RNA sequence: AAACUGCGGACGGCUCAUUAUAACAGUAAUAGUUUCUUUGGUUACAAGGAUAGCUUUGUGAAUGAUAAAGAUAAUACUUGAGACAAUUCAUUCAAGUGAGUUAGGAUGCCACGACAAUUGUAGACAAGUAACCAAUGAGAAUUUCUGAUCUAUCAAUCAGUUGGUAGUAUCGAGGACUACCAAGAUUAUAACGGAUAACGAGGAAUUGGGGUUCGACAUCGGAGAGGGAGCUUUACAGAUGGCUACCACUUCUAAGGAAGGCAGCAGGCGCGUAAAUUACCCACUUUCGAAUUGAAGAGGUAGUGACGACACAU
RNA sequence: AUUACUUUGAAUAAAAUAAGGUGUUUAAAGCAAAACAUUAUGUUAAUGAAUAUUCAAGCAUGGGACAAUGC
């Protein structure tokens, strides 16, 4: 929990110290490891100061090597007017992933909402995941 | 100060004694910036005056009418100084404009600014109390 | 002048970006002013919208918190022992946020960590671990 | 003639005045094809002070 | 650009001034106010072709420099003041008191009032807000920060508002017996009652609308208007009394 | 690939297939502006070094009368035919001559 | 009149070199920032110095050139009262909104701290000012999603590069920058690179349908002022009909030195197949200003005009 | 359980396109005007096209046959 050079705290610490945690807006339900979890993150959607805001989207977890964040691919169809058919496209999205999710692995459908920059590229937070199968490697967060 | 053989200030600031193409301003007072922040970079004299300096015109120096070749009141409080007492010129007598004696314009001051002012304001802070008042009946039956 | 803008970085595939514009003063970016450890200097630099940042260059002063007391007082700082960031900073003495400071608690009659940003607010202000 | 409108606050009356062939104003006439009738606007000011101030 | 525009392209102007496009290069630039620029008809427009009163803009100027304007209570001076909606526009010396209220046609229109009605003018709330020291307030869709406020005027309510004494005269809240004005799109200019209103946490509140004739079309929450309750009206509606013809 | 999905390969057939066109490829390729004497202009500007006479193809007999032109452009050299009859005679050297293409296009 | 002071020249006008997910179009966010003008509202019968126009003496060929001395004003620059607000930090109580240790209140020190020490005698009533809330803002600026032409004689690319923590800087998020740690990020669904005689869109030409080609140019968005760079002023400029330096040019010269940036309007050279008057006026539209009055090569009028379009002689 | 598909909207700068009206002598045009009160009066608070759209995305909703993604 403390293992950097600096004191980790809560964005929103107080005495009774206690655990923070608020819930985001259209019914998302926070997960238990976010009540009674010890982790600190200052990023994480349900224990910080990070809303979430009107665009929402979907898509299945590719690469979880990233510390607490995670790229997630969209597959989508593209129509071309002058032959009347569709075509296969994807769009890779860098999204970050709280410690709340310790079972999320690379293969699992998530659910992901905007919030402000908080990286280069990272604009998108998870909000929750379903898991799939299993492909010889379990890469978790 | 003087000017130069060519006519040029002796930039006080630059104590050199020669022209000194520098940025010109009215920093230097050598130069007035024809547009926004316009320095125009331009020679002018050295401070220290010296050979080929004509005019000079007060280095340690004073009237002395130069050398080459190498009205009255009009405020009040300053005026006083020296109504009846301020210094009038010359058939279309134009004294100047009297100001911070009491101003003796005074009446308008008077019945405008502070009494005209200061009035409103203790009316203001009255609704100011008042309406808070009548905020009383805000939580009082709504809880 | 420093310059924020992301026109000058790669894209998230490597590839290096193509100029289009001059820079801007929208992005425009100022030298950091280390507030080392000294006699009281502050600059009042006039930034967008006419706003005013008190630039702290050198400071000795700071208003110190105890939480568990209520109470905060004045006092000297003595000597910047520890920056989670830069090891330099302590040689440098440099007063940034979260730079660990011990002070005489000469005051305290009735070790700190700094909570203020003295380059943008103008002094330090911290609180006693 | 034809649109008649008052006013006061310019101090005329803005009439339309149809021909059907220093207090006054005669201008925007236009006329057929060959001649014949013509229209135009008539602007009265009434008071000499108004042409003397009210025009551009 | 480097910072804010000071003209406007005839083209560019919204469509609802009805500009001719051979007119002229420029439009008239609203000044800004309690009116956004979309939102308000320039005081030029208003008395230039909605009254003909001045042929051109050197007759507008010798118009409302000369104090022969009272927008709302007070008396503006300004030749592109921001006119937008049901705030009332009076003119003592030809004693007529206007107001400019929506149209089917998606058009300001100038209602003929009387003197007595003329003295009020109905506001919509648009937020609630907690000041400093605990003093509340609210904000009209005039962008009038009203003192004190009653404790149950809410967010999207209706308040009357009165011009020489400035007080809150009576208050209409939001709910689906009432009836409304449009200033919005499709809907735009259109009477009709609250019937319905379904919400949805992400993006908008959409409020069906039900039309005197039994026409219903929806909208969004942004757009309604509360105009009185109970399916009266506490203001004159334009000529077409808010009906629209299919 | 008629299939629904299949507006990929629908749609690199035809980039690929279209540069088999004689025609459509010659006015894309960067050549007009180097290899053609005129590049995109419709007529051009030259000077008059040497008067020719060419001899007809094989079922004709006679002389094909022409110059030879250098542009003020390119600085190349073209062979440009006299439009009508006897008009050799009004021609000089070293003067300006207008080169306007032919009835098929280049 | 002139001068100081305030406001403006950051709008308008021109051009299309740069630019290949950059810009632009629709769309969404700003609970991640935000001024200027304008609007609603809230918060000692009077002090102090100097300065221009003004006078006088001058220089230099000269620029919209500049020197000393003698004074004289403020709604220019300051002190000061008539008595809160807003900023940082630490702690704490807590109701709208989809959603906030959130608006807001309470405690303790720190910085800042006013409602001109103001103006008409006539158009008590105006007028003016300093901060702070809300509007104007659907605005500006960043940002989310989707969408672009040809090329594989371009198949692997990136090292601040991908992520984390602390800080720094900014109006503000952010590798934007710095220190430490990890090895990551893109790619056959075409990454990376190359070409463009490539500014993007609304749209134009032609079309039975499907489409093909075009769009510098009315309007909207972007960028630039010979080429880069660096800055001042102010609310907004990395301004160029502002400044500094270098690169490249042009002009005046008393030979000592000095300014200039027509991708503004006319006009000239050159270039080419290829393209108009060195005219008049702010009266229409509109903007700027201390404001009904001045200015505007914006705008209108006039001249040239077999680019085109409409009706119509012999 | 989502997506895709399809139907209604919401929202959506103008100019331009199609288009409604209108005798610029007709037409291109322009959004002006006039049947008329034989006109100051009223028609008149006159007309301003609903102007329809607009592809690829984005929001909501009615339907689940044809398709896609794992349990």
Same mark, same amino acid.
């Given at each position: 929990e403390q293992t950097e050079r600096a004191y980790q705290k809560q964005v929103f610490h107080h005495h009774s110290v206690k655990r923070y945690h608020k819930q985001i807006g259209m019914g998302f339900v926070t997960p238990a490891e976010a009540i009674k979890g010890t982790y600190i993150d200052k990023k994480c959607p349900f224990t910080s100061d990070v809303s979430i805001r009107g665009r929402t989207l979907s898509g299945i977890v590719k690469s979880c090597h990233m510390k607490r964040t995670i790229i997630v691919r969209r597959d989508y169809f593209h129509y071309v007017s002058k032959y009347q058919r569709y075509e296969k496209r994807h769009k890779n999205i860098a999204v970050h992933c709280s410690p709340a999710f310790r079972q999320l692995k690379e293969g699992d459908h998530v659910v992901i909402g905007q919030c402000r920059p908080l990286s280069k590229t990272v604009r998108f937070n998870v909000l929750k995941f379903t898991s799939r199968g299993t492909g010889d490697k379990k890469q978790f967060a | 100060g003087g000017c130069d053989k060519d006519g040029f200030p002796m930039m006080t600031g630059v104590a050199t004694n020669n022209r000194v193409r520098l940025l010109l301003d009215g920093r230097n007072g050598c130069y007035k910036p024809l547009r926004n922040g316009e320095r125009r970079r331009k020679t002018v004299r050295g401070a220290?005056?010296? #050979?080929?300096?004509?005019?000079?015109?007060?280095?340690?120096? !004073? !009237? #002395?009418? #130069?050398?080459?070749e190498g009205a009255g009141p009009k405020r009040a409080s300053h005026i006083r100084k020296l109504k009846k007492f301020v210094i009038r010129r010359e058939k279309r007598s134009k004294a100047p404009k009297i100001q911070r004696l009491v101003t003796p314009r005074r009446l308008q001051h008077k019945a405008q600014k502070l009494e005209a002012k200061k009035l409103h304001k203790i009316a203001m802070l009255k609704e100011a109390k008042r309406y808070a008042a009548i905020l009383n009946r805000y939580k009082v039956l709504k809880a | 002048g420093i310059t924020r803008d992301s026109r000058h970085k790669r894209r998230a595939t490597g590839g290096k970006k193509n100029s289009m514009q001059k820079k801007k003063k929208n992005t425009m970016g100022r030298q950091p002013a280390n507030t080392r450890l000294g006699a009281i200097r502050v600059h009042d630099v006039r930034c967008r919208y006419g706003i005013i940042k008190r630039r702290a260059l050198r400071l000795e002063n700071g208003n110190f918190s105890w939480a568990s007391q209520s109470i905060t007082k004045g006092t000297k700082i003595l000597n910047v022992v520890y920056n989670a960031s830069d090891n330099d900073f302590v040689r440098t003495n440099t007063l940034v946020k979260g730079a660990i400071i011990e002070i005489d *608690?000469? *005051?305290?009659?009735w070790l700190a960590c700094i909570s203020s940003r003295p380059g943008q607010t103008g002094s330090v202000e911290g609180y006693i671990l | 003639t034809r649109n008649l409108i008052v006013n006061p606050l310019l101090c005329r009356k803005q009439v339309v005045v149809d021909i059907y062939h220093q207090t006054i104003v005669l201008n925007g006439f236009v006329t057929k094809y060959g001649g014949g009738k013509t229209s135009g606007f008539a602007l009265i000011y009434d008071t000499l002070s108004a042409l003397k101030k009210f025009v551009p | 650009a480097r910072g804010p525009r000071h003209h406007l392209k005839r083209l560019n102007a919204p469509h609802h001034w009805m500009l001719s496009k051979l007119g002229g290069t420029f439009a008239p630039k609203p000044s800004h106010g309690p009116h956004g620029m979309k939102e308000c008809l320039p005081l030029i427009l208003i008395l230039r072709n909605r009254l003909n009163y001045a042929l051109n803009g050197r007759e507008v100027t010798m118009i409302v420099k000369n104090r022969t304007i009272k927008i709302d209570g007070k008396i503006r001076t300004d030749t592109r003041y921001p006119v937008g909606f049901m705030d009332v526009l009076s003119i003592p010396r030809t004693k007529e008191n206007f107001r400019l209220m929506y149209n089917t046609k998606r058009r300001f229109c100038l209602v003929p009032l009387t003197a007595e009605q003329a003295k009020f003018k109905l506001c919509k709330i648009e937020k609630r807000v907690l000041g400093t020291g605990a003093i509340p307030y609210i904000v009209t869709h005039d962008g009038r920060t009203i003192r004190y406020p009653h404790p149950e005027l809410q967010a999207n309510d209706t308040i009357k508002l009165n011009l020489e004494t400035g007080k809150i005269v009576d208050f209409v809240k939001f709910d689906i017996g009432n009836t409304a004005m449009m200033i919005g799109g499709?809907?735009?200019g259109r009477v009709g009652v609250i019937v319905k209103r379904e919400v949805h946490p992400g993006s908008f509140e959409i409020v069906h609308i039900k039309d005197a004739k039994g026409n219903t079309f929806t909208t969004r929450l942004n757009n309604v208007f509360v105009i009185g309750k109970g399916t009266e009206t506490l203001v004159n509606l334009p000529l077409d009394k808010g009906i629209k013809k299919p | 690939a008629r299939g629904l999905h299949a507006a990929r390969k629908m749609l690199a057939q035809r980039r690929a297939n279209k540069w088999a066109d004689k025609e459509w490829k010659k006015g894309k390729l960067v050549t007009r502006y180097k290899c053609n004497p005129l590049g995109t202009a419709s007529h051009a500007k030259g000077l008059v070094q040497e008067k020719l006479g060419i001899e007809t193809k094989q079922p004709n007999s006679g002389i094909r009368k022409c110059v030879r032109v250098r542009l003020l452009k390119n600085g190349k050299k073209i062979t440009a035919f006299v439009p009508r009859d006897g008009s050799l005679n009004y021609v000089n050297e070293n003067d300006e001559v207008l080169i306007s293409g032919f009835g098929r296009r280049g």
């Open positions: - | 220290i005056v010296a #050979g080929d300096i004509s005019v000079l015109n007060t280095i340690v120096v !004073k !009237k #002395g009418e #130069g050398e080459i | *608690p000469a *005051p305290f009659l | - | 499709n809907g735009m | -």
